[PDB]
Amino acid sequence: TLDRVGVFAATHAAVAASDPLQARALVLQLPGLNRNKDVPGIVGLLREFLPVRGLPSGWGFVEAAAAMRDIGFFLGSLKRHGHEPAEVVPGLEPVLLDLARATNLPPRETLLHVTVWNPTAADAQRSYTGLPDEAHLLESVRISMAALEAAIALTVELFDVSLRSPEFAQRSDELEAYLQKMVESIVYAYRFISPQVFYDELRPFYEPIRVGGQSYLGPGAVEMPLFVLEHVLWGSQSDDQTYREFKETYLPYVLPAYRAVYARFSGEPALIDRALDEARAVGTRDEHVRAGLTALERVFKVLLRFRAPHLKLAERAYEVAPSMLGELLTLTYAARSRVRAAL
Numbered sequence: 389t390l391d392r393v394g395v396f397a398a399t400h401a402a403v404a405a406s407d408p409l410q411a412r413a414l415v416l417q418l419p420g421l422n423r424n425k426d427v428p429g430i431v432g433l434l435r436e437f438l439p440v441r442g443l444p445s446g447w448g449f450v451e452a453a454a455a456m457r458d459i460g461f462f463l464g465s466l467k468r469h470g471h472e473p474a475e476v477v478p479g480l481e482p483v484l485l486d487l488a489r490a491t492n493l494p495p496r497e498t499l500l501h502v503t504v505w506n507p508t509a510a511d512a513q514r515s516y517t518g519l520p521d522e523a524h525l526l527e528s529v530r531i532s533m534a535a536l537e538a539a540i541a542l543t544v545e546l547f548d549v550s551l552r553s554p555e556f557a558q559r560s561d562e563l564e565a566y567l568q569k570m571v572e573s574i575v576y577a578y579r580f581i582s583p584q585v586f587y588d589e590l591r592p593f594y595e596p597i598r599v600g601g602q603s604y605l606g607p608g609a610v611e612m613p614l615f616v617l618e619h620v621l622w623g624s625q626s627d628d629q630t631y632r633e634f635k636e637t638y639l640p641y642v643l644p645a646y647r648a649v650y651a652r653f654s655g656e657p658a659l660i661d662r663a664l665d666e667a668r669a670v671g672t673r674d675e676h677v678r679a680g681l682t683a684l685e686r687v688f689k690v691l692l693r694f695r696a697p698h699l700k701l702a703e704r705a706y707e708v709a710p711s712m713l714g715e716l717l718t719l720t721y722a723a724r725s726r727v728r729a730a731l
């Protein structure tokens with residue numbers, strides 16, 4: 389029934405099916421080498437497939453992203469053992485910059501590379517550690533990524549829909565159904581991911597690396613374009629400094645299309661600012677205004693049903709959390725409160 393997911397899942401599967409460096413059997417050997425902390429071996433394994441003579445001219449986005457994925461697991465691994473990958477692998481940096489050029493993404497692996505663009509089968513899935521907890525971590529993102537992309541499209545569409553129209557309530561109800569997948573992700577994480585194993589065994593693989601004379605953050609679900617959705621939905625005109633910096637920090641890591649969505653809405657009132665201004669002008673005696681606001685409140689409810697438990701999970705891992713999480717939750721409650729007050 390979440391019919392819009394299909395196309396996004398299909399585009400992900402295209403990258404996941406691609407192995408342009410014929411590296412599948414090679415990357416599967418990485419977990420054992422990480423367990424052994426075998427740095428020379430990690431470099432040697434990478435050199436078995438790293439292009440030395442530039443990128444094949446026939447490659448498009450799909451091949452370049454797939455290549456970045458397979459090289460990428462080596463980047464996080466080398467840094468995990470205390471080494472700048474660019475410093476220990478000659479000729480690596482130019483390849484990373486070429487792949488960045490070909491994908492219009494940063495010159496290292498991102499969330500997309502390690503989750504939705506990473507095949508799912510046991511004989512193919514790339515991993516830093518080979519641990520069950522890592523496999524569960526990747527699955528938690530696959531549960532909701534395509535749904536989130538659909539949700540972004542639905543939010544952009546809703547922005548131009550009048551609150552006076554019955555379409556507003558209907559589109560909002562639809563948006564809520566897609567955002568429920570984020571809740572499913574966190575439920576999944578609670579059930580299957582050890583916060584201790586995350587903190588002690590997985591987290592070390594996601595440190596920043598230096599390429600091209602700047603630092604690039606490691607993969608994380610923090611890179612999910614949920615912040616772009618909410619930029620459009622409520623946050624575009626926020627004067628909260630910490631929040632603004634958070635969005636600008638992760639902007640480079642999302643797909644080009646979402647970076648442009650973000651740019652489009654930055655110089656404008658957010659959806660709810662427009663929605664509430666309309667409600668105050670027309671009045672809540674209009675049934676479609678009442679229904680629209682009610683449906684919009686339910687959208688905030690589902691964001692909070694993701695965000696509140698997520699914070700507890702993050703705090704539990706650190707018990708074995710960064711301040712921006714609690715700050716973002718507070719902003720989200722305030723956003724919902726504005727809708728509640730309008731009614």
Ligand code: HEM
Binds near residue numbers: 570583702713
């Ligand atoms: C034990 C598992 C998890 C831990 C320990 C964790 C931890 C964190 C931390 C510490 C942050 C703040 C950013 C940072 O400093 O890295 C964060 C942000 C974020 N996380 Fe998680 N996380 C977990 C699971 C998940 C899952 C399953 C999802 C969704 C699939 C998710 C989605 C997000 C998003 C979208 C952000 C950006 C901030 C926000 O929207 O509130 N996380 N996470």
Ligand SMILES: N[C@@H](Cc1c[nH]c2ccccc12)C(=O)O
Binds near residue numbers: 502526529594610
């Ligand atoms: N949200 C956390 C933990 C997390 C969830 N899914 C992930 C996938 C890859 C790396 C980290 C994660 C983070 O961004 O760090």
